[PDB]
Amino acid sequence: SLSEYLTKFRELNVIIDQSPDSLEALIDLCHSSLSNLSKDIKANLSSNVNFTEGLIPQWKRHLEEYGYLIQVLLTFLQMENLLESITKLLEINPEKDLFIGLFTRPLFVLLKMFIQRILAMCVKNHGQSSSIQSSLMTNLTYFLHLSVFNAELLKLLNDEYNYPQLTEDILKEISTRVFNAKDTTGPKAISNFLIKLSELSPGIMLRQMNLVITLLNNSSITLRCSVVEACGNIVAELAQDPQTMEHYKQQIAVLIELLEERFQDSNPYVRTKAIQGCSKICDLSSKFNKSKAKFTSLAVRSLQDRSSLVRRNSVKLLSKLLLKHPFKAIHGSQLRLSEWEEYLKGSESQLNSTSVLMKLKLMIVYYKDAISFIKEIHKSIELISNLLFNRNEVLESMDFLVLADAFDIELSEFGIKKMLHLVW
């Protein structure tokens, strides 16, 4: 009577610890040391009959009634024992679909180490990806704190258990499901979940980036912030274990182009989050010649903004790009305009007057990049000097230009004079 039991959803110790009617009476009576001894004896008996292999309907019944009574007891509420028993009965691997559903949904309603193990070991179902996907959807739609837990579970599915089929399936369903902007507390939870999944397991979130394009054009600012932090963490990871993959290279290219596009988005929060993302991905272990060049140009054209926090975030951008500038090949920590101009003029005079030609032309391109960077820093210093003359922007911008002046420039004395004129 599996369907009937699903729809409906002392003297006993003398027979449980030592027929159908007796089993039904015991199940009705059981529906706390006796409960613990019963769960251990049932767990080891199930493990034994599964390791040793007509009699399956009795076990099916017993497990159905026991799961129902355990669900009732847990939704009614000495706790670690029942979690341990659940983990034990989960290792022994239709009615199983409803069984795992009635284990997951009440636990989702109730929702740490044993609970984490329970949530990790209950996804061993095969072919039932639709049910777990639907439960995760209802969790993300109704629950808020379960976002980081689902992120950790997907991470364990990524690296711990190494089951890429379920991970790819869940990622495809997440990237293909429709989203609405009128959701209350929904986009924030989804953004937190995606941020945690990116900072904790960015290896799978990158493979399906060809489909997250529809999520890249989301109207919600929280989703845009989340995907920006996600691609930032992805670029960081791809700089850690370079793997030097070509598909990952073109993914980096397209996401960084989207970042240059979003650098002028119509919201201060998404702009600051993109600023944090490029601040996290600029100081990695790579060259990024054109990447840093376009970073510097788009930071020098947008330094004269209108908001407050975006201005200080761009100042921190300039600070981080100055303290880690690639112009350290010849006489590093020195950006004298005349020192580069004289070398450029000498190279241009030597041009009109094979490997040697390659090396001198690459040095010429390097000097051109250096002089463009120095004219950009000059114009940005001019802009910030005519703009500064909010106390937070005043107190956060001093450390930037003092180290900018530490690198000797032709505007050193004029910059100091402007600083003095500004401080009063």
Curated annotation (Swiss-Prot):
Compartments reported by the entry: Nucleus; Chromosome
Disulfide bond positions: none
Superkingdom assignment: Eukaryota
Additional observations: Present with 2540 molecules/cell in log phase SD medium.
Function field: Regulatory subunit of the condensin complex, a complex required for conversion of interphase chromatin into mitotic-like condense chromosomes. The condensin complex probably introduces positive supercoils into relaxed DNA in the presence of type I topoisomerases and converts nicked DNA into positive knotted forms in the presence of type II topoisomerases. The condensin complex probably also plays a role during interphase.
Assembly information from the UniProt record: Component of the condensin complex, which contains the SMC2 and SMC4 heterodimer, and three non SMC subunits that probably regulate the complex: BRN1, YCS4 and YCG1/YCS5.
Family per record: Belongs to the CND1 (condensin subunit 1) family.
Protein name: Condensin complex subunit 1
Species lineage: Eukaryota, Fungi, Dikarya, Ascomycota, Saccharomycotina
Gene from which this protein is expressed: YCS4
Residues represented out of the complete protein: 5 to 589 of 1176
